[PDB]
Ligand binder design. Structure first.
Ligand SMILES: Cc1ccc([C@H](C)Nc2nc3cc(F)ccc3o2)cc1NC(=O)c1cnc2ccccn12
Length: 276
């Protein structure tokens, strides 16, 4: 529950808490195991226990799945699926769009449809992710995608978060205008972050959203959405993205939260309409 002795620690996969590739004899069975740092504070331990609880809610092919736990003894462990290809941002970065390692346009749509399906599931639970982005997705065998949430602290993605002393850490470049101005999050702001995530996929993660603008400019842009005088600025159409699919992204960035398409409609478009 889970038998900790059945675990065989093999390699470190990354870094609050280390993640390790482990083997389970059942024989070539691989899992990911997250362990609390030896010097974790009482606050870190509490957060870890809550992550376990939140994660235990989530049961979908395109969401990270809690396979097991070791909490009745120290140190605390969380066990998930091992996703061979690591995070989606690093994965796409190592690929180029097929001409005429490579990835094809239809494969990009399949990646995006899987994210939409995972988010469709979350919406059914009335669960708001709050930090959807390619950096929070993992890639397994055969371009299979699982949405996760690594938190906001990793050095690699430091530049994706706006930090003011004593305030919540904010992924402003993925955030709906109402999130920036009022600091609250909904399924409708998850849709907006999905539009930005889809922009990243079609960019093959080559540039930060609004990359040529400062943090302060991105925040003032939310103000311009609010005022609605036609001065707001949008992510440009990626090279690999045709106009029809771009117009979908634009609906995700509608000023009015109710005008943003539900994830059920987004999934339909990506899995069906976008095929023609
Ligand atoms: C073992 C574990 C525990 C926890 C988590 C994730 C980060 N925790 C998490 N997601 C959430 C999604 C929500 F909606 C809400 C809360 C969430 O909390 C992930 C993992 N697994 C890996 O990180 C992993 C697997 N395969 C590889 C390959 C390379 C690198 C890393 N990995």
């Amino acid at each position: 529950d889970f038998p900790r002795s059945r675990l065989r620690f093999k390699e470190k996969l990354g870094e609050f808490g280390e993640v390790h590739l482990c083997e389970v004899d059942s024989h070539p069975l691989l899992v990911a195991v997250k362990i609390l740092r030896p010097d974790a504070t009482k606050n870190a331990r509490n957060d870890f226990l809550k992550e376990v609880k939140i994660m235990s809610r989530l049961k979908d092919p395109n969401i990270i799945r809690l396979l097991g736990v070791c909490v009745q003894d120290d140190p605390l462990c969380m066990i998930t699926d091992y996703m061979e290809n690591g995070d989606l941002n690093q994965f796409l970065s190592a690929h180029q769009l097929e001409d005429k390692p490579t990835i094809s346009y239809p494969m990009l749509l399949h990646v995006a449809a899987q994210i939409a399906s995972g988010m469709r599931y979350l919406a059914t639970l009335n669960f708001v992710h709050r930090d959807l982005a390619t950096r929070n997705c993992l890639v397994g065998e055969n371009f299979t995608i699982k949405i996760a949430d690594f938190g906001m602290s990793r050095n690699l993605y430091a530049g994706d978060y706006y930090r003011v002393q004593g305030r919540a850490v904010l992924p402003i470049r993925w955030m709906a205008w109402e999130c920036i101005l009022m600091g609250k999050f909904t399924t409708a702001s998850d849709v907006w972050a999905f539009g930005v995530t889809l922009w990243e996929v079609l960019m093959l993660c080559r540039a930060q959203p609004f990359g040529q603008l400062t943090d302060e400019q991105v925040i003032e842009n939310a103000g311009e959405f609010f005022r609605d005088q036609g001065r707001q600025v949008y992510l440009s159409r990626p090279p690999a993205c045709p106009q029809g699919l771009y117009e979908l992204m634009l609906r995700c960035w509608s000023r009015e939260s109710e005008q943003r398409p539900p994830f059920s409609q987004l999934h339909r478009f990506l899995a069906e309409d976008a095929l023609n």
